[PDB]
């Protein structure tokens, strides 16, 4: 169903993943992702997660439907979700700066969505723990109320007390290299250990925090948008570029001096560094981050 009722109006994204369209379903905007063949298995994993898990949370992208539809003499794989007209956090941050409240609301809402993903709730009305594995600004959408929701669950891995085996391939280097945690890049991560995947999300969250904080204005000062590690790796960095910086040199994004003139950015700088520990077990939990951000307000 639904695929029939949907008219595609304008393509708002196109890449190796496929395309994302603004469509109309009974006159209502929906986001339609048409997967590339390359990413067909992500469509299935994401579809099955959303269809089997009650994953309704204000800070997780709202699923509507999935469909298989043959159109251009070939089958199309569609994922249909709520449409967030503001688009991705990545693109939003390049258009505007943030005051203190808008910055906190963004980062807290991401922490809230990530904590909800991570938490296992027993039973019906509950949910397995979920690790995202590709958290970054391009996979986060901004809402008009200034909160964000986390998107793109095609690499996510789930865990509950039902089974010890995880639906993860043998290759741990699945995400976006620029955001890959050190234990992924050097491939020492314990693929058997679900908690290890949560900690990889926390590392990436720290990087997103840094990206956002750079755009918060303090005393008329603000940084331009940059991706993590812009100053030391080329675009489309290689595994080796990333490993030398992050694993061998053990470098991190630098904190602009101006942040320490503002107590919010001072607090956030402290927080992102607690997300970036080389040792995964020292990193704050998602819920700890959320509780901390609830108080920094
Ligand atoms: C890696 N970047 C991407 O993919 C791109 C396309 C993704 N996009 C998703 C989306 C949908 C999904 O499924 C259906 C996904 O997968 C679950 C998903 O994953 C991240 C994202 N909804 C969107 C809603 C709107 C827009 C958008 O830009 N409109 C244009 C206006 C923006 C603001 N003014 C300044 C300019 C014009 C873009 C959206 C982001």
UniProtKB/Swiss-Prot annotation:
Residues of the active site: 134 (proton acceptor)
Q: What does changing residue 126 to E do?
A: In FOP; variant phenotype
* Protein kinase domain span: 6-297
Catalysed reactions listed for this entry:
L-threonyl-[receptor-protein] + ATP = O-phospho-L-threonyl-[receptor-protein] + ADP + H(+); L-seryl-[receptor-protein] + ATP = O-phospho-L-seryl-[receptor-protein] + ADP + H(+)
Is-annotated flag, keyword Isomerase?
no
Q: Which residues are on the Cytoplasmic side of the membrane?
A: 1-297
Give the first-level EC class, as a single word.
transferase
The record gives the effect of mutating residue 5 to E as:
In FOP; with some atypical features
- Look up the EC number in the record and give it: 2.7.11.30
Biological process terms from the Gene Ontology for this record are:
activin receptor signaling pathway; acute inflammatory response; atrial septum primum morphogenesis; atrioventricular valve morphogenesis; BMP signaling pathway; branching involved in blood vessel morphogenesis; cardiac muscle cell fate commitment; cell differentiation
Question: What residues does ATP bind to?
Answer: 12-20, 33
- A cellular-component GO term for this protein: BMP receptor complex
Q: How does it sit in the membrane?
A: Single-pass type I membrane protein
Q: Which cofactor does it need?
A: Mg(2+); Mn(2+)
Keyword Disulfide bond (UniProt): no
Q: What is the effect of changing residue 173 to P?
A: In FOP; variant phenotype
Q: Which family does the entry's similarity section mention?
A: Belongs to the protein kinase superfamily. TKL Ser/Thr protein kinase family. TGFB receptor subfamily.
Involvement in disorder: Fibrodysplasia ossificans progressiva: A rare autosomal dominant connective tissue disorder resulting in skeletal malformations and progressive extraskeletal ossification. Heterotopic ossification begins in childhood and can be induced by trauma or may occur without warning. Bone formation is episodic and progressive, leading to a debilitating ankylosis of all major joints of the axial and appendicular skeleton, rendering movement impossible.
Q: What does this protein do?
A: Bone morphogenetic protein (BMP) type I receptor that is involved in a wide variety of biological processes, including bone, heart, cartilage, nervous, and reproductive system development and regulation. As a type I receptor, forms heterotetrameric receptor complexes with the type II receptors AMHR2, ACVR2A or ACVR2B. Upon binding of ligands such as BMP7 or GDF2/BMP9 to the heteromeric complexes, type II receptors transphosphorylate ACVR1 intracellular domain. In turn, ACVR1 kinase domain is activated and subsequently phosphorylates SMAD1/5/8 proteins that transduce the signal.
- Protein name according to UniProt: Activin receptor type-1
Organism the protein comes from: Homo sapiens
The gene from which this protein is expressed is ACVR1
């Amino acid at each position: 169903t639904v695929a029939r009722q949907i008219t595609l109006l304008e393509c708002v994204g196109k890449g190796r993943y496929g395309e994302v369209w603004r469509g109309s379903w009974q006159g209502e905007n929906v986001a339609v992702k048409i997967f590339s063949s390359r990413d067909e298995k992500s469509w299935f994993r994401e579809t099955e997660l959303y269809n089997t898990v009650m994953l309704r949370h204000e800070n997780i992208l709202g699923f509507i439907a999935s469909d298989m539809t043959s159109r251009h003499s070939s089958t199309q794989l569609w994922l249909i979700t709520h449409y967030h007209e503001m688009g991705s956090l990545y693109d939003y941050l390049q258009l505007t700066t943030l005051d203190t409240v808008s910055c906190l609301r963004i980062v807290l809402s991401i922490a809230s969505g990530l904590a909800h993903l991570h938490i296992e709730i027993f039973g019906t009305q509950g949910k397995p723990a979920i690790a995202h594995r590709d958290l970054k600004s391009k996979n986060i959408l901004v809402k008009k109320n200034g909160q964000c929701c986390i998107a793109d669950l095609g690499l996510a891995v789930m865990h509950s007390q039902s089974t010890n085996q995880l639906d993860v391939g043998n290759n741990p280097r699945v995400g976006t290299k620029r955001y890959m945690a050190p234990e992924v890049l050097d491939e020492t991560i314990q693929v058997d250990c679900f908690d290890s995947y949560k900690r990889v999300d926390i590392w990436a969250f720290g990087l997103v925090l840094w990206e956002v904080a750079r755009r918060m204005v303090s005393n008329g000062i603000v940084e331009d948008y940059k991706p993590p590690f812009y100053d030391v790796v080329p675009n489309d960095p290689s595994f080796e570029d990333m490993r030398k910086v992050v694993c061998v040199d053990q470098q991190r994004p630098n904190i602009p001096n101006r942040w320490f003139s503002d107590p919010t950015l001072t607090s956030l700088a402290k927080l992102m560094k607690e997300c970036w520990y080389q040792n995964p077990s020292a990193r704050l939990t998602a819920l700890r981050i959320k509780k901390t951000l609830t108080k920094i307000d």
